[PDB]
């Protein structure tokens, strides 16, 4: 049975010892887990999906007004079919790249740090901007709470992450649209935690040994472990190998990752061994992976 964890105690409810234990079991046995009781408003989620379908149904020429080339070093905007390079060929996939909304007078923008700056939003869906940023705020708060549960599940103090790597976290948010195939015909996330919202007719899969379906479950987010959490636990919490295998699907992966300048180190007690070998900051690490998916910029 797939692990579905009620995380209400980490959100708005009285404490329950079993929550941290269940998170630990899920990371050790499965590498991923569903969460319920996350506190993210369902109407906000429904409005994010509705405004997303509205955007992807626009004409291509309108969608390309917020194409990623206009996002600059901030790494934001729209990509059409073929716009992402995965498995060595342009992907039959379109989507949207978002990150923290930073004003131009923010020090990171004034320093010209890659992956920092403003998001792009379409003139044609005027209420999309507010919905997206409210969702990112809700998910950023959920991320911090889930890292506490992850800390507890390792026998650590609950604020272990907040005090070292995630006080000022790297938050990345994408909206992916998979059209039905034109004809009839594996990876790991790089940060700490992926919090994924799936649509109902979603088709996601995760490894085990065996590829298993991680079907959509109402009221849940699917969470999995990233390369940096793998590194920090010396491989105890294994970064989750997954893939998307039909018709028209939307998905909304949210990534809760370390500070851009954080050097995530293995716990001394688990440091017995990319990933475990990598010298540099999370920003260095993230930047290398971004250079491969978009050779443009
Ligand atoms: Mn992924």
């Amino acid at each position: 049975e797939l692990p579905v964890i009620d995380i209400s105690p980490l959100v708005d409810a009285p404490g329950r010892a079993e929550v941290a234990a269940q998170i630990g079991q899920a990371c050790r046995e499965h590498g991923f887990f569903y969460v319920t009781g996350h506190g993210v408003d369902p109407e906000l989620q429904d409005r994010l999906e509705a405004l997303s379908r509205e955007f992807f149904a626009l004409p291509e020429e309108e969608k390309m007004k917020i194409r990623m080339a206009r996002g600059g070093r901030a790494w934001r905007g729209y990509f059409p079919v073929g716009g992402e390079l995965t498995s060595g060929k342009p992907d039959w996939k379109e989507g949207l790249y978002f990150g923290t909304e930073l004003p131009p007078d923010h020090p990171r923008v004034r320093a010209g740090t890659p992956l920092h700056g403003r998001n792009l939003f379409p003139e044609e869906v005027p209420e999309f901007r507010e919905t997206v940023l409210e969702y990112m705020d809700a998910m950023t708060q959920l991320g911090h709470r889930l890292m506490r549960g992850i800390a507890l599940s390792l026998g650590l103090p609950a604020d272990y992450f907040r005090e070292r790597y995630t006080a000022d976290p790297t938050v990345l948010f994408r909206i992916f649209h998979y059209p039905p195939p034109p004809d009839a015909d594996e990876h790991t996330d790089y940060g700490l935690l992926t919090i994924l919202k799936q649509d109902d007719c979603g088709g996601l899969q995760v490894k085990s040994g065996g590829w298993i379906d991680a079907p959509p479950i109402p009221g849940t987010f699917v969470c999995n472990i990233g390369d940096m959490l793998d590194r920090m636990t010396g491989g105890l919490y294994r970064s989750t190998p997954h893939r998307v295998r039909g018709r028209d699907r939307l998905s909304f992966p949210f990534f809760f990752d370390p500070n851009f300048d954080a050097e995530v180190q293995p716990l001394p007690a688990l440091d017995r061994a990319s990933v475990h070998a990598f010298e540099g900051t999370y920003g260095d690490y993230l930047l290398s992976k971004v250079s491969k998916v978009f050779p443009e910029l």
Side-chain angles (χ1 to χ4, degrees), residues 55 67 123 127 134 208 216 252 283:
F55 169 81
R67 70 191 170 269
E123 181 68 7
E127 48 289 288
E134 185 186 333
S208 63
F252 314 78

Side-chain angles (χ1 to χ4, degrees), residues 114-129 131-135:
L115 277 46
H116 292 64
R118 275 218 194 282
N119 297 289
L120 266 39
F121 292 100
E123 181 68 7
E124 293 70 24
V125 193
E127 48 289 288
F128 201 21
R129 187 184 186 266
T131 301
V132 164
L133 295 173
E134 185 186 333
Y135 185 74

Side-chain angles (χ1 to χ4, degrees), residues 204-206 208-226:
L204 158 76
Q205 302 188 297
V206 274
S208 63
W211 282 96
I212 54 188
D213 289 298
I217 300 177
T220 67
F221 299 114
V222 184
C223 306
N224 61 73
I225 299 166

Side-chain angles (χ1 to χ4, degrees), residues 68-69 71-85 88 90-129 131-182 184 187-199 202-206 208-237 239-244 246 248 250-272:
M68 282 199 226
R73 72 191 326 106
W75 213 244
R76 310 292 166 80
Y78 169 77
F79 69 92
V81 295
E84 260 193 1
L85 197 61
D91 209 348
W92 182 250
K93 188 223 266 206
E94 49 170 348
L96 284 164
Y97 270 56
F98 299 110
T100 304
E101 179 72 4
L102 291 186
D105 67 309
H106 185 282
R108 282 293 181 177
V109 172
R110 299 199 84 209
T113 314
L115 277 46
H116 292 64
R118 275 218 194 282
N119 297 289
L120 266 39
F121 292 100
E123 181 68 7
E124 293 70 24
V125 193
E127 48 289 288
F128 201 21
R129 187 184 186 266
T131 301
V132 164
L133 295 173
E134 185 186 333
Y135 185 74
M136 289 192 69
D137 282 337
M139 298 301 285
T140 297
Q141 171 178 65
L142 170 58
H144 280 303
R145 291 162 169 179
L146 281 172
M147 289 326 284
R148 266 180 142 103
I150 286 169
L152 288 181
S153 79
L154 290 160
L156 291 173
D159 282 312
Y160 184 88
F161 297 101
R162 197 69 147 92
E163 298 223 275
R164 289 158 182 85
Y165 305 127
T166 56
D168 186 27
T170 296
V171 311
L172 310 168
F173 176 58
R174 284 84 170 92
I175 307 185
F176 292 142
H177 175 234
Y178 303 84
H187 69 283
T188 64
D189 308 334
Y190 328 110
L192 288 175
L193 183 66
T194 298
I195 313 176
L196 166 70
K197 171 179 166 64
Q198 307 191 250
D199 80 345
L204 158 76
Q205 302 188 297
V206 274
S208 63
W211 282 96
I212 54 188
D213 289 298
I217 300 177
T220 67
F221 299 114
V222 184
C223 306
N224 61 73
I225 299 166
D227 287 347
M228 283 311 105
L229 195 39
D230 195 318
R231 170 194 183 89
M232 194 193 78
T233 63
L236 179 62
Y237 287 4
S239 197
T240 310
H242 58 286
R243 78 194 174 190
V244 173
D248 200 277
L250 272 180
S251 67
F252 314 78
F254 177 91
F255 304 91
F256 190 94
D257 286 355
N259 196 278
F260 195 85
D261 290 339
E263 291 177 350
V264 168
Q265 298 292 356
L267 278 174
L270 305 176
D271 177 30
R272 293 170 316 276

